[PDB]
Each structure stands twice: as structure tokens, then as C-alpha cells.
A paper describes a structure:
The initial data included 260 691 particles, yielding a 3.1 Å reconstruction of the entire ribosome, which was further refined and Bayesian polished to obtain an improved density map with an overall resolution of 2.75 Å for the entire particle. The final density map accounts for ∼92% of rRNA components (18S, 5.8S, 5S and 28S rRNA), two partial tRNA molecules, and a total of 30 and 40 rProteins for the SSU and the LSU, respectively. Inspection of the density map indicated that two tRNA molecules bound to the 99% of 80S particle; however, while the E-site tRNA was more clearly visible, the density for the P-site tRNA was weak, implying either high flexibility or partial occupancy of the sites across the particle population. We compared the inter-subunit bridges in GL to those in known structures of eukaryotic and prokaryotic ribosomes and found that most of the previously reported bridges are well preserved in the GL ribosome despite the lack of many eukaryote-specific rRNA ESs. However, the only case of a protein–protein inter-subunit bridge that is missing in the GL ribosome is that of eB8, involved in two contact points between eL8 and eS1 in the human ribosome. These contacts are absent in the GL ribosome; therefore, we propose that this region may be targeted by compounds that would not bind to the human ribosome. The structure analysis of the GL ribosome revealed an evolutionarily conserved architecture of the known universal functional sites, including the peptidyl transferase center (PTC) and the decoding center, which are formed by the rRNA. However, using modification patterns of the L. donovani and the human ribosomes as references enabled modeling of a significant number of modified rRNA nucleotides in the GL ribosome EM density map. Most GL rRNA modifications, although not all of them, are localized in and around functional regions in the interior of the ribosome rather than on its periphery. Taken together, from the evolutionary aspect, the GL ribosome appears to be a ‘compact’ or a minimal eukaryotic ribosome.
Numbering used by the authors:
A (entry chain J1): 2 to 167
B (entry chain X1): 1 to 142
C (entry chain I1): 2 to 39, 50 to 174
D (entry chain E1): 2 to 259
Write the structure that this text describes.
RNA sequence: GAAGGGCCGCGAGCCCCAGCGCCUGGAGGAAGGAGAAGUCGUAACAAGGUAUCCGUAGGUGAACCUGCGGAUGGAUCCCU
RNA sequence: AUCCGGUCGAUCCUGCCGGAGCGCGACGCUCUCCCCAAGGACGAAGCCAUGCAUGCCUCAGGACGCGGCGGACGGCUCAGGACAACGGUUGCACCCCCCGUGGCGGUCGCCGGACACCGCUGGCAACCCGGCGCCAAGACGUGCGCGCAAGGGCGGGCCCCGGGCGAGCAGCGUGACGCAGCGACGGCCCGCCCGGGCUUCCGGGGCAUCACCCGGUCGGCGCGGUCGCGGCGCGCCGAGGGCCCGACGCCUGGCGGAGAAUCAGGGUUCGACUCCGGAGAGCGGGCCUGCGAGACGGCCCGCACAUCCAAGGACGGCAGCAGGCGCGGAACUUGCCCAAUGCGCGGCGCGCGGCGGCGCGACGGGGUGCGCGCGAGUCAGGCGGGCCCACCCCGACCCGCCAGGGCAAGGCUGGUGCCAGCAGCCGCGGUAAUUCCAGCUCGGCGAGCGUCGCGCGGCGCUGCUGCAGUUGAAACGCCCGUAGUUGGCCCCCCGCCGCCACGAGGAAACGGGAGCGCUCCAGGCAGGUUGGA
RNA sequence: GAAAAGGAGUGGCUCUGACGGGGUCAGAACUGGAACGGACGCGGGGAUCCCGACUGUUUACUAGAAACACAGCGU
């Protein structure tokens, strides 16, 4: 067989069960307003990634406090959530992995980082400037709007010094 | 308990299930094969044939209308069916020997609405989709 | 060809069993030697090499008298008994286990030393001795053996009685 | 099939060969000889994939043509040559002499040694038998044979061999209390002391060892190679056959980047 | 030692007979279903104008009628 | 871990019908940029024009030929086959094996003629061959040699229990046969190895409108054949063997597993194709050569089909790669390269395998603006690449598809007047239509939307978890009764099952899962003392 | 129904086994124009319709049947 038959691939979003439901059909465009979202697949994707960390946490929390699998994956899960900035330092217990939301995932996009840093007038301006290739992340130039910035790479957001803007 | 129990009754709990599944009309309809036989399409999404006559069908008891249909002779097994031509005015695009493509109404071969005896419909005539043909996106030659 | 595959036999409940391949070479059978008494030894090439000697028309063999511990060579004279069938006796066909008469001339110097089995000595005074074939003529191209004694001798003499 | 197998798909290759699932549809298939097909690692996969002496098959071949690879004191020219446990690996142009041992995850490591060390070979006595005209032979785990063996040498013990003259100088006895290293199983690469040899009629005999920090383990007697007598006769890697557990390993993988 | 021949072992192909499916023609005959607004009566629902209904047997254009035993789901929870 | 609409004058139920989600294909409409990627499997295992798919190196400039090694591996497909095969788990004290590794090597004076390539003459329509002749061996043949191939007779203990074992197994000795193999460039032979054959146990489709079934069938003795055991075969003797814990028979649009789809838990359904195992090469059969084949890119015959031909004859097997026909709702080029990966032989060969082409099956990422700068294209140079190109880098120019009465988010003018038409289900339409046909306006998801068929879910409408049986569908008219299922209380601290835990031993890939910024990402196993736990 | 329908073997000679002197039954090798119940003796078969249930009786000398009788049934 050609060697390409052996590559893995996978879907990254889940579509809600009841589509035509007014109350959250409204709070769903509210999110497309408070950030610059092309369509609903980027809310679906955020729900998809929150669901998995929730499922892992419930699996671990069924278990017992002195157990090895807790001692392994709880520490791993908290470390990766803290370094992505989905969870902050003061909450170092697994039971806090349950009370997150989509919004704290959205907070660490570049479009949010540069608006905290005030590098763009707004979020829609931030989007257009992202694709114009004008903002770099620590000396390397990042074309991605959905880019997820570790709080280590979060001090080094700025204009890309090769740009019409220095 | 009106059901058998006890650690050594697995064989009976399986015999009961196997016998009682056939009392469900859907399980029997999808697993007995007599429908797979009686099905004019022989278990497919669609099939083609040649038109043998154009007919009109008088609607069922509450409504009143003359729906439009064609008697189709299937190519793959030489059977007779009737297909409802949808979408106002389309019955003109179905000549007396045409290769037409036939699919279903839904409901796995049950009559729909008020059209008696018809479980199929035509979706393409002479290589052209009838939706676009109605919508003036393609045109039959002459 | 001839085969000894089991797939053509029934199960242990009597049911016809199905057929899921074509004859394999490694289950072949061959026809048998049917070694006639009284000098050919064919060669057969078996699986992986392995010369097999296949006899036709043997005349002599090496025969051992055990209790006296004397061996001589001798000319098979006649096949007289066989446990399977009278047909292999009537045709003088050399197979393992058959009982034959051998020439007495080689063993006539044992007629001197006394305190020996008189049932062997008086038979040496004649002109043959009764013996059994111990080898497989169709597999190794040879027919050697031992002279009978014990209850077994008496058993075969009674089978040979003038009834 | 209708005969022997020549080819070998990459996925069907042994897991401990550490091949990568991309980079081909085929794998090198080891050739018959001094070791098997499962408990070995070929010469090409050592040179080309480990040490980068060659970046390709087409130039590993020529390294083996002008005879640059001494295995067990004798050269080799076959890329698919199976080198295994305790074999000596000396290339002179780069001044490197090794012996093959197992790591503590069941993989093949090349330990550096000295010219006072590459003069002998440890073999496991697989069996004692009789050949032509009634003579005794000992056949071992490296497919060496020794005739007229000293009667004290019995099955499952270990011998020490000279690579040049091919004769036995020392032997070690498999008893209760011998320093020994495993070669298969899920404790492959671990070293301990024989402290139980439990026998069973008809079936396999089981062996129970312990490291020098108290951790104990079990295996079949087919997987217990003897290395010394309360002291190893050959060198062993700076981990010495003690396995960490998953969390200790994880902190080390954290440290190496920290 | 070749061609060629004799007997058996393996085993095509065809013939011939029986089994075993599955599909299909057919004068007649007899059901079921839908379009129906066609005749003839009025069996049921009220004590439906002879309370209704079960089993069985017979009889009549049709629904149905009648005999023998049963039931209330009856039109009666009620009397030396 | 969720419901909704459809049986009334109104009302509570049962119960189905219809709607709402994911996936697989097919059809319709539409299409800016990049990355990944499946693709004549679907009761046609139907038929094939054309080309290619297997070669590489002892004896003389070289070819040619001889000799040798390989062509039994690799590729394709799923027709047959349901106590098979297959999966785990045993065994061979019933076996066979090339290459390679390590051993071992004792065997009762340089020989002989002849074959192909080639020379001279030929037959034939073409297919293919004849006759004569001069020439080699790491080719045969014979063989120089210190006796040892197969098989066979005797050499065991008459409570029972190291050469090697759990196990009387393997050697040796000694009486007879025989003369095999190795020797004209020293190898017969032996351990290991990978591979095979068979073999123990447990798992291993539907139908009872298939209840009895089998007769080398079940066992015993003896020979034969086999690499070998065995009713495997043959002779003789006996009457066994399987079965409601489902035999036997029939059917399958039956390849098995690793796995995949769905989604609280328990479950349902599918296992064409990536790895492993099996089986076949149009359909029955037979066989030669070889360590290894019942081989079809080997041969021989019967059948069904086709091909050239001067009419006498010869000849084929795409379920190999491309391509054609036919079938069907349904599936791409009659490309270039052996540079990597591997295998063969040895520097080459390889339609393995790779690299481009077709490719809205499907996956992942980014736009159609923001308040004033970009990508999409064009032209140049790198980088990469067997040769081009795509990605990256530097220079100069520069939506659409469905709907708007309810289920279910979204409401005025004209036309038509139970017509035409809509409508999955309720229902709409009778000359004032919230539903048809249109215009305006608004809703939905969005480079993708809609229609059709099927699987899972919805469904506690298949119920082990967990349904119902007075009247809605449903307790056999009753009593006895075998198989089956179930069975009070008691002694603890023994043995044998069940059960619970923890191990050992065997495959990756997939599924999870630790670490790692392909700019992110679907990914991959990277990478800056390392690592792939 | 039924010997349904349909198939195969069968001579001579040389032997072998089973039954408690006596033949029968079973098996094998060889052999003959490709023959064998070698003369003799000795059913052709099947699908249906009408009548009478059946075995039996009758027009000696042109009619053997569907006619008579019959068991059973009834008066
Ligand atoms: K119940
Ligand atoms: K129940
Ligand atoms: K029950
Ligand atoms: K019980
Ligand atoms: K039930
Ligand atoms: K055979
Ligand atoms: K075959
Ligand atoms: K074979
Ligand atoms: K295969
Ligand atoms: K084989
Ligand atoms: K082979
Ligand atoms: K692979
Ligand atoms: K691979
Ligand atoms: K190899
Ligand atoms: K190469
Ligand atoms: K009929
Ligand atoms: K009407
Ligand atoms: K009445
Ligand atoms: K009446
Ligand atoms: K009345
Ligand atoms: K009444
Ligand atoms: K009434
Ligand atoms: K009545
Ligand atoms: K009545
Ligand atoms: K009556
Ligand atoms: K009457
Ligand atoms: K009446
Ligand atoms: K009446
Ligand atoms: K009446
Ligand atoms: K009545
Ligand atoms: K009545
Ligand atoms: K009356
Ligand atoms: K009356
Ligand atoms: K009555
Ligand atoms: K009465
Ligand atoms: K009654
Ligand atoms: K009632
Ligand atoms: K559920
Ligand atoms: K409804
Ligand atoms: K309703
Ligand atoms: K009601
Ligand atoms: K209801
Ligand atoms: K196809
Ligand atoms: K096909
Ligand atoms: K196919
Ligand atoms: K199908
Ligand atoms: K070969
Ligand atoms: K071959
Ligand atoms: K091969
Ligand atoms: K193919
Ligand atoms: K198949
Ligand atoms: K099939
Ligand atoms: K081989
Ligand atoms: K090879
Ligand atoms: K087995
Ligand atoms: K078994
Ligand atoms: K088995
Ligand atoms: K089994
Ligand atoms: K059944
Ligand atoms: K028999
Ligand atoms: K036997
Ligand atoms: K027999
Ligand atoms: K018998
Ligand atoms: K069954
Ligand atoms: K099939
Ligand atoms: K279930
Ligand atoms: K579940
Ligand atoms: K489950
Ligand atoms: K379910
Ligand atoms: K469920
Ligand atoms: K496929
Ligand atoms: K396959
Ligand atoms: K497969
Ligand atoms: K595979
Ligand atoms: K395979
Ligand atoms: K295979
Ligand atoms: K295969
Ligand atoms: K096969
Ligand atoms: K076949
Ligand atoms: K064929
Ligand atoms: K075939
Ligand atoms: K064949
Ligand atoms: K064959
Ligand atoms: K064949
Ligand atoms: K096929
Ligand atoms: K095919
Ligand atoms: K191609
Ligand atoms: K077509
Ligand atoms: K077509
Ligand atoms: K290559
Ligand atoms: K190719
Ligand atoms: K620009
Ligand atoms: K540009
Ligand atoms: K510009
Ligand atoms: K510009
Ligand atoms: K536009
Ligand atoms: K419409
Ligand atoms: K529907
Ligand atoms: K509905
Ligand atoms: K109007
Ligand atoms: K359900
Ligand atoms: K459920
Ligand atoms: K109940
Ligand atoms: K009722
Ligand atoms: K009923
Ligand atoms: K009852
Ligand atoms: K019952
Ligand atoms: K009862
Ligand atoms: K009872
Ligand atoms: K009872
Ligand atoms: K029981
Ligand atoms: K039960
Ligand atoms: K029980
Ligand atoms: K009980
Ligand atoms: K247990
Ligand atoms: K593997
Ligand atoms: K005769
Ligand atoms: K008469
Ligand atoms: K008579
Ligand atoms: K008469
Ligand atoms: K007359
Ligand atoms: K008369
Ligand atoms: K008469
Ligand atoms: K008559
Ligand atoms: K008369
Ligand atoms: Mg592969
Ligand atoms: Mg009345
Ligand atoms: Mg009345
Ligand atoms: Mg294919
Ligand atoms: Mg499967
Ligand atoms: Mg082939
Ligand atoms: Mg071709
Ligand atoms: Mg078609
Ligand atoms: Mg359910
Ligand atoms: Mg009569
Ligand atoms: Mg008369």
C-alpha cells in the first residue's frame, strides 16, 4: 500500500443536538460579537476541547487521593492547563478543572492577548492586522488568528520588526 | 420475578431474546429478507428506466387534485413502477421513451400524502436534474 | 494423486464435511512395492531428498538365532503364513512379519554343539528352518530376520498343522 | 506461502527495534546465523540509524565491503547480520570497542570497553548432547558448540570464551545466589540475584530475583543469563539495571529540558 | 534403451436415471384491498323495538334465524 | 443521563406514525487560497486489443553460449469453505527444511568423450527445427583414500519410585548383511536458525413449517503407504459413535481476527480493502523440476470461449500496472524513475516501492476587510527536486443552498381560485390563500448546502441493568410429570471446583497516555547532555 | 401399491474360509471371438377415463359381461 494510507486524521468539533433553539442561539451570536468569529465551528471546536479535559477530570476524580494515576495525570493536566493559561496559579487542585468555560479558552488567543496589550484598536482590527502579518510572537512571525499563546511566550508579543509599521 | 434469574440462566436469557425479536415489525422488516426481495429497487438508493406512459392520479379523500406521474420500466430487472413527477409544470419534460432516474419519497417505500399507489419519484430526465430543469439552470435540447 | 488428507473423511458424528482447498503435494500417497520373492531395488526420491529403497524380487536375507547367538545368510525358500490374508501367502509376497522357510545349509554346523534347542536341531537335520521377517521391504529394500522359538514357534507350527 | 519468508513489513518489525512508522513500507529482515530474529538488532540498524556513520543503505554496504566492522573478533560483510547480547563491537578506524547489553526498557545498548576487556565472551549453556560416535557437545545461546566439555559444566550455566582460540577458560554455576541479568519478558535488562528456583513437573520452572535496592521480580528460567558470582564479570551501564518508575522518569524528562 | 501394447491407480467429459431447490404459462374457480355515491333489506349501538355475547349443530337472497349448555362485559349488588 | 407534533365537544392514557443528532455511499446546485488524503469491492471470480510487470554473475576484444543463484519471496482478489478457517493455548518420547552461523572431516598418481555459441549446407505461410564439423570447465562420468550410510538380532530392573529427562530416552558394545554418500580446485555429516506440517484445550452464523442422524460410520488386530502419527488405505473382528447443553439437514447478496460506526452506564450493527492468517489464478483434474510448488507472468488433458493462417497447421489466460468493452446509482493517466525503502543477485534489475497527473468521498487551516494596509494573481532569483513543479524565502507590478402556519429560528403586494400546485406528519387551496406561483423584506448553516438509501441514537417500542399481561395486545380448561432451573438452618482451622487480587508469557498499527511550538492545525516522532516512558 | 419404475453380476479351472459325515453360503487368482439362466423352462412397462367393490356364477352348440350372486343395509 502507498505509505500515505497509514496517516492519522480526526474531526475536532461537535454540533449541538437541537439546532433551532432561541435562548442560546442568541448568546451564541453574542460570542461572535465579543470576539471576531467567522462562524459557529469555532464555538463548536472550543466546546470540543473543553469536553475532553472535563472527561479526563471526571475519570481521575472517580479515583482515590493516594493513587498513581491521579498522581500522574492530575499533575500533568494542571501543568498543561496552567502553562496554556487556561488555569491560573492559585488553583492547584483537580476539582477546579470542572468550573472552567469556553471563555477562558478564548482569552488566550492572540486576538485577545494583543487587545490586553493594546496593540490593536479593537478585536476586528486585531483580526485584520493578524492576517496582514504585522504582529510577531517573540521574533517569529505568526499568521494564525486562532494561535494559542503560552504565558511564557506572552511577554514577547509585539509588531513583527519586518513590517511597514516600524 | 416474571423473568428468569439465577447465575446459570444465560442460555435461557438468550433464547428468549432471540425468539421475541421477530415480534417487532421493524426488526422483522429489516432482517427477514422478504422485503429485500419484494423491493423493486433491490435495496438501493436509486435506479434507472425508460418511460412507457404519462398518467394522472386523482388525489385521496380529503384533498382534490390530479397529480402527475409516469409508468416506468426498470432497466436492471424489467419491472413496472409508477413515479410521481413533482414541481409544477415538469410533466412536459418527460417524453414517451426517456432514460429517467428514480429515487424514493422517504418512509422506506410507503405512500406519502394523498397520492395513491406511488412510492417512487423521478429526479433526472435524459441526464439532466429535474430540480435545475424546473429552476431554468439547464435545458433539454429540442 | 493418491492422498491421505483427512478432509475427505466425515466427522465423528457422521456429517459430510466441506472442501476448502485443492490437493496439497505434501499429502501424497504412492503405490506399494508388493515385493515378490526370488534382484531389483529401486530408488525413490522423497520429500527433501531422502533416498528410499524399494524392493522387488528379493532372494536372500541375514537370519539370527538368538538363544544360541548364531547369524548366517540364507535363501528365502517359501512364504508360508501371514496374519492379514491368505492372498499374500499364496503369492509369496514379502512383507514385514510374514513367516517363511529358509535354507538349512548355513546353520548345519550348529548341529554339532548339543544342549541346544532340539526343536531347532531336528529341523536343521531336515532342509529348512522356520523364521519371521522383521524388516520393511518396501521402505528399506531388505528382508532380514530371526529364527522362531518359544511359545511363538509352537503357535505357528499348530497353524501349519496338516489340518 | 510456498516457502521461506524473505520480506518484512515495517509494522511487523519487533517493537524494540525502535523503527518509525513512516519512512518506508519495508524493514531489513535479519539473516540466519549466530542469533535469532526476535532477540537481535541488525548491523545496519546499528550503524546507519544510530551512529550516522552512514546516512543510507548504499553507503553502509561499502563500509561493510572494505571490511570495517569486527564482530566477535572476526569481520562481517552482511548488512542484515544479526548481532545480539554479549557480542563485541569494535571498529578500529574510530577506535571504538563495545559489548552489547540490554537497557532497562528491553533495548540494545553498546557499552564501551577496553582492550583488556574484549578478550572474552560470555555464553549461556543451552544444552548438552551426543553427536558422532558418542561424543559430548555443549551448544549455547550464541550458537557456539564445544566438544569434550568438562563434566562440571552443566545445562543453564555460563561459560567464558576466547574469541581467537575458541576454548573455555572460566565457567560460572547457576545456583541460588548468583548475580544475573534478564534477557526477555517485561523485566528485560534488569539485574539481581537468584534467590528462588521453583520447579514444576512437566511445565516451566520459575525464577525469583531481587535488585540491590530490594525490588523483586519473577520470570521463566529461559530468561536468566548469569554474569558473575556476587560480582559481574563484564561491564554494565551506569544505570546498572535498576528501573525507575514512571513518575521518576517523568521528572527526569522534565529536568533534561529544564 | 524409443515408438507401440496389457492390467490396475488417479480422475475429466458425456450419457442415462433418479433426488433437491428456485422461478414461471394456464381455461376455469375463489378470496382480499382501494375508487367508488349503483341496487336490496335493517343485523348492532337506547330494553335498538325478540337483552347482547361465547362453544357447538342445523337452516335461510343477504345481513341473519333456531335448538342445547355457558357468561354479565345486563336491563338486577335489595326479601319464609 | 433532555424531548417534541399527529385519535376528543373537551379530558387522562396505551400505542404507533412523523420530527430533531452523528457516520457511510449515490444524485442535484455552487465554488477564492494552502496542507492531508480515499478512489471498478457492493448476488459481472464477466470478457480482454496494446505495451510493460524478473533478472544478476565457471570456462575466451567482446558479445553469444555453457554453467550457477533466483524466479515457491514480492503484487492482486475474496469465488469457494460454517465443529472449517481463524483467535488465544499446548505438543511432536510421531516429523521435514535452503541460506547463514558454529562445529566435524580416518572411508572394505593429473584421466575419459561430448554439448551448447560458432562455420557449411537446408525444410517451413509462420510457429519452430533438421544434417555434417572443428573447440573448455568451479559441467558431467569414473574415480587415487586410514572402513562405516540406512535398516535388522542380542545385550534392563522379575514390593513401586548422570550424556539427558517428569517420563527406558539417547549413545555404545557384539554377532550378521550391504557398499550408499564424500573424493580430478574437500565434503559427506551435526547442533542453532527462520519456515512448514500435523496436533491438545476454550471461543467459533440463521432456520424446528429441519427430530432423529451416521454406516470407514465408532472401536480392535495386522500390514502397506507417508517426512511422519492417525480408518489415511486395505484385510479380518466387534457394534459402536452424535443428539432439546439443539445432533443431522437446509439457507447465506458467509473470508476470520487485530478492528470500525454510534454514545452517561449496560449495549446495538458492520467486519470488501492498510497488519497478521487462510484460499484461488476461466472451471474439473494430473504432474515435472527443485530444500521448498499439486506453481498457472511452468508443462499435460477434458469443457466453455476467443486468435493468426497459403486450409496443411500453430496458439491464449490482466482476481499484476495503466487502458478498453459490458454491467451498474456508483470508482482517475494507455505518465517519469529505481534517487530513497526493501528484496534479488551484486551496481544492476525491480509497474515493490517512489515522484508528478485526474480527484468538493472525506479531513485541517485561512479570506471576501479594517479605517487605510494586505493576499489572490504577473514577472525575476533562490531553496527543493532522479528531471519539473507545489510549500517557504527575497525584488519590482497589483458568497451559495434551503426556508419564513405548527413541530422549528424567520411576515406586505400582485396572480390563481379544491385548478395548477404545496405538503416527511398535522394540514393548505372553493374567485380578502400567514402554506401554491412571484416581488420586497427577514431566518438558518456557510465553500459548502439540499434530496435519496442504510447503520447507530432517539426507544425503558426488545427491557441483564430495565417493559407489559383484571378491563388497552397478552396467564396454557385442569392435575401428574422427565430434561432444565432453583432449593431452609447447622460444624472451621482439611481437600477439590467457582470467585477476588497480584503476577508470568505472547504484535505492531489503532485506542488512550508522558515529553516535543510541523508559524497554529488535521499531524509526525521529533529535537537542543537527549528522547520515542 | 411392489417383481412398481429401473440398474449390476452369473461359464471353466486352481484355491481359501464358516457351520456338526454333509452340503450349503461367502471370498480370491488364472483363463476363454468382448462368453456364460449358452438348449429347455420363463412378467413387457408406464400416465389416465368409464363400469362393477372384492373371490365366485352364466346363455352344453355364435353372447363370460357392465348381467346373476355376495357380505352389509332397510322394510
Ligand atoms: K411481567
Ligand atoms: K417483565
Ligand atoms: K418467564
Ligand atoms: K444457583
Ligand atoms: K419477552
Ligand atoms: K495428492
Ligand atoms: K491450489
Ligand atoms: K506441497
Ligand atoms: K496469501
Ligand atoms: K512447502
Ligand atoms: K523455501
Ligand atoms: K508497514
Ligand atoms: K510502514
Ligand atoms: K535479508
Ligand atoms: K540501489
Ligand atoms: K400458478
Ligand atoms: K367518485
Ligand atoms: K338480534
Ligand atoms: K331480528
Ligand atoms: K331486530
Ligand atoms: K337475547
Ligand atoms: K344489548
Ligand atoms: K341470544
Ligand atoms: K347459538
Ligand atoms: K342442530
Ligand atoms: K330453518
Ligand atoms: K333464516
Ligand atoms: K335469517
Ligand atoms: K329459523
Ligand atoms: K339467532
Ligand atoms: K343467537
Ligand atoms: K325457526
Ligand atoms: K323453530
Ligand atoms: K341459540
Ligand atoms: K340437552
Ligand atoms: K360460554
Ligand atoms: K370487560
Ligand atoms: K440512553
Ligand atoms: K402532527
Ligand atoms: K396530539
Ligand atoms: K375517548
Ligand atoms: K397519547
Ligand atoms: K466492479
Ligand atoms: K468487477
Ligand atoms: K469483486
Ligand atoms: K449488497
Ligand atoms: K530455483
Ligand atoms: K519459480
Ligand atoms: K521465494
Ligand atoms: K485492483
Ligand atoms: K470469500
Ligand atoms: K459470495
Ligand atoms: K529456501
Ligand atoms: K535467499
Ligand atoms: K489441534
Ligand atoms: K483440539
Ligand atoms: K485444536
Ligand atoms: K473449540
Ligand atoms: K431453528
Ligand atoms: K469395511
Ligand atoms: K490402521
Ligand atoms: K477396511
Ligand atoms: K466393520
Ligand atoms: K440448530
Ligand atoms: K458475496
Ligand atoms: K441490550
Ligand atoms: K454504552
Ligand atoms: K459498554
Ligand atoms: K440504546
Ligand atoms: K442507550
Ligand atoms: K477502499
Ligand atoms: K487484502
Ligand atoms: K485483510
Ligand atoms: K497485509
Ligand atoms: K499477510
Ligand atoms: K498470508
Ligand atoms: K493473504
Ligand atoms: K492458497
Ligand atoms: K478456483
Ligand atoms: K484457470
Ligand atoms: K480453477
Ligand atoms: K487445476
Ligand atoms: K494434482
Ligand atoms: K492441478
Ligand atoms: K475479483
Ligand atoms: K474479478
Ligand atoms: K500507472
Ligand atoms: K451504464
Ligand atoms: K450510465
Ligand atoms: K532504489
Ligand atoms: K507505479
Ligand atoms: K499588498
Ligand atoms: K505577491
Ligand atoms: K498592494
Ligand atoms: K502595495
Ligand atoms: K459575491
Ligand atoms: K414551495
Ligand atoms: K420520513
Ligand atoms: K411531524
Ligand atoms: K387574491
Ligand atoms: K430502540
Ligand atoms: K437507554
Ligand atoms: K410486569
Ligand atoms: K372489553
Ligand atoms: K387475541
Ligand atoms: K394458565
Ligand atoms: K403455552
Ligand atoms: K401441567
Ligand atoms: K406438577
Ligand atoms: K412434580
Ligand atoms: K438439573
Ligand atoms: K431457566
Ligand atoms: K441447579
Ligand atoms: K426453589
Ligand atoms: K476467579
Ligand atoms: K510485530
Ligand atoms: K465360475
Ligand atoms: K358383474
Ligand atoms: K381366486
Ligand atoms: K366375474
Ligand atoms: K351366442
Ligand atoms: K357365453
Ligand atoms: K370373465
Ligand atoms: K363391463
Ligand atoms: K346371469
Ligand atoms: Mg505495508
Ligand atoms: Mg336486538
Ligand atoms: Mg332487542
Ligand atoms: Mg480495488
Ligand atoms: Mg471479519
Ligand atoms: Mg506468479
Ligand atoms: Mg495486457
Ligand atoms: Mg448505471
Ligand atoms: Mg432500547
Ligand atoms: Mg365383478
Ligand atoms: Mg354359447
Amino acid at each position: 500500500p502507498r505509505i500515505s494510507r497509514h496517516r492519522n486524521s480526526s474531526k475536532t468539533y461537535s454540533t449541538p443536538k437541537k439546532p433551532f433553539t432561541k435562548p442560546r442561539l442568541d448568546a451564541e451570536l453574542k460570542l461572535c460579537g465579543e470576539y471576531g468569529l467567522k462562524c459557529k465551528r469555532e464555538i463548536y471546536r472550543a466546546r470540543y476541547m473543553l469536553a475532553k479535559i472535563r472527561r479526563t477530570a471526571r475519570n481521575l476524580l472517580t479515583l482515590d487521593e493516594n493513587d498513581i494515576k491521579r498522581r500522574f495525570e492530575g499533575a500533568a493536566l494542571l501543568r498543561r492547563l496552567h502553562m496554556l493559561g487556561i488555569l491560573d496559579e492559585e488553583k492547584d487542585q483537580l476539582d477546579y478543572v470542572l468550573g472552567l468555560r469556553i471563555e477562558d479558552i478564548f482569552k488566550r488567543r492572540l486576538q485577545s492577548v494583543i487587545v490586553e496589550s493594546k496593540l490593536a484598536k479593537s478585536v476586528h482590527h486585531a483580526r485584520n492586522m493578524i492576517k496582514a502579518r504585522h504582529i510577531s510572537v517573540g521574533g517569529q512571525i505568526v499568521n494564525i488568528p486562532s494561535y494559542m499563546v503560552r504565558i511564557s511566550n506572552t511577554s514577547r508579543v509585539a509588531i513583527a520588526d519586518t513590517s511597514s509599521l516600524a | 420475578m416474571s423473568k428468569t434469574s439465577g447465575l446459570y440462566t444465560a442460555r435461557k436469557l438468550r433464547t428468549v431474546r432471540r425468539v421475541n425479536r421477530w415480534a417487532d415489525k421493524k426488526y422483522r422488516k429489516a432482517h427477514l429478507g422478504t422485503w429485500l426481495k419484494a423491493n423493486p429497487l433491490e435495496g438501493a438508493c436509486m435506479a434507472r428506466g425508460i418511460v412507457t406512459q404519462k398518467i394522472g392520479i386523482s388525489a385521496k379523500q380529503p384533498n382534490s387534485a390530479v397529480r402527475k406521474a409516469v409508468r416506468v420500466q426498470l432497466t436492471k430487472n424489467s419491472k413496472k413502477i409508477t413515479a410521481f413527477v413533482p414541481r409544477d409544470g415538469s410533466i412536459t419534460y418527460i417524453d414517451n421513451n426517456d432514460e429517467v432516474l428514480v429515487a424514493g419519497f422517504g418512509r422506506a417505500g410507503r405512500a406519502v400524502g394523498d397520492i395513491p399507489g406511488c412510492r417512487f419519484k423521478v429526479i433526472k430526465v435524459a441526464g439532466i436534474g429535474l430540480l435545475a430543469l424546473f429552476l431554468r439552470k439547464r435545458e433539454k435540447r429540442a | 494423486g493418491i492422498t491421505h488428507d483427512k478432509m475427505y473423511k466425515r466427522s465423528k458424528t457422521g456429517a459430510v464435511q466441506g472442501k476448502w482447498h485443492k490437493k496439497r503435494k505434501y499429502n501424497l500417497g504412492r503405490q506399494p512395492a508388493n515385493t515378490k520373492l526370488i534382484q531389483k531395488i529401486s530408488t525413490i526420491r522423497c520429500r527433501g531428498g531422502n533416498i528410499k529403497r524399494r524392493a522387488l524380487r528379493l532372494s536372500h536375507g541375514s537370519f539370527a538365532w538368538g538363544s544360541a547367538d548364531i547369524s548366517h545368510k540364507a535363501r528365502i525358500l517359501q512364504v508360508v503364513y501371514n496374519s492379514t490374508s491368505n492372498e499374500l501367502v499364496r503369492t509369496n509376497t514379502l512383507v514385514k512379519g510374514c513367516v517363511v522357510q529358509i535354507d538349512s545349509a548355513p546353520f548345519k554346523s550348529a548341529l554339532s554343539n548339543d544342549t541346544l534347542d532340539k526343536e531347532i536341531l531336528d529341523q536343521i537335520r531336515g532342509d529348512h528352518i522356520l523364521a519371521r521377517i522383521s524388516s520393511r521391504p518396501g521402505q528399506v529394500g531388505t528382508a532380514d530376520g530371526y529364527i522362531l522359538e518359544g511359545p511363538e514357534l509352537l503357535f505357528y507350527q499348530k497353524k501349519l498343522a496338516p489340518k | 506461502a510456498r516457502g521461506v519468508r524473505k520480506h518484512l513489513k515495517r509494522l511487523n518489525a519487533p517493537k524494540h527495534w525502535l523503527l518509525d512508522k513512516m519512512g518506508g513500507i519495508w524493514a531489513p529482515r535479519p539473516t540466519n546465523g549466530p542469533h535469532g530474529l526476535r532477540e537481535c538488532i541488525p548491523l545496519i540498524l546499528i550503524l546507519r540509524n544510530r551512529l550516522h556513520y552512514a546516512n543510507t543503505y548504499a553507503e553502509t554496504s561499502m563500509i561493510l565491503q572494505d571490511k570495517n566492522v569486527l564482530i566477535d573478533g572476526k569481520p562481517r560483510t552482511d548488512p542484515t547480520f544479526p548481532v545480539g547480547f554479549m557480542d563485541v563491537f569494535e571498529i578500529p578506524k574510530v577506535h571504538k570497542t563495545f559489548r552489547v547489553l540490554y537497557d532497562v526498557k528491553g533495548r540494545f545498548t553498546l557499552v564501551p570497553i577496553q582492550s583488556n576487556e574484549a578478550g572474552f565472551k560470555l555464553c549461556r549453556v543451552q544444552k548438552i548432547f551426543l553427536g558422532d560416535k558418542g561424543m559430548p557437545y555443549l551448544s549455547t545461546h550464541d550458537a557456539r558448540t564445544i566438544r569434550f566439555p568438562h563434566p562440571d559444566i552443566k545445562t543453564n550455566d555460563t561459560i567464558k570464551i576466547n574469541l581467537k582460540t575458541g576454548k573455555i577458560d572460566e565457567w560460572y554455576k547457576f545456583d541460588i545466589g548468583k548475580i544475573v541479568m534478564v534477557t526477555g519478558g517485561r523485566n528485560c535488562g534488569r539485574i539481581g540475584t537468584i534467590q528462588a528456583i521453583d520447579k514444576h513437573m512437566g511445565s516451566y520452572t520459575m525464577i525469583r530475583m531481587k535488585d540491590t535496592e530490594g525490588t523483586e521480580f519473577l520470570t521463566r528460567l529461559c530468561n536468566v543469563f548469569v554474569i558473575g558470582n556476587d560480582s559481574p564479570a563484564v561491564a554494565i551501564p551506569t544505570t546498572k539495571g535498576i528501573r525507575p518508575d514512571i513518575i521518576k522518569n517523568r521528572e527526569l524528562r522534565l529536568r533534561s529540558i529544564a
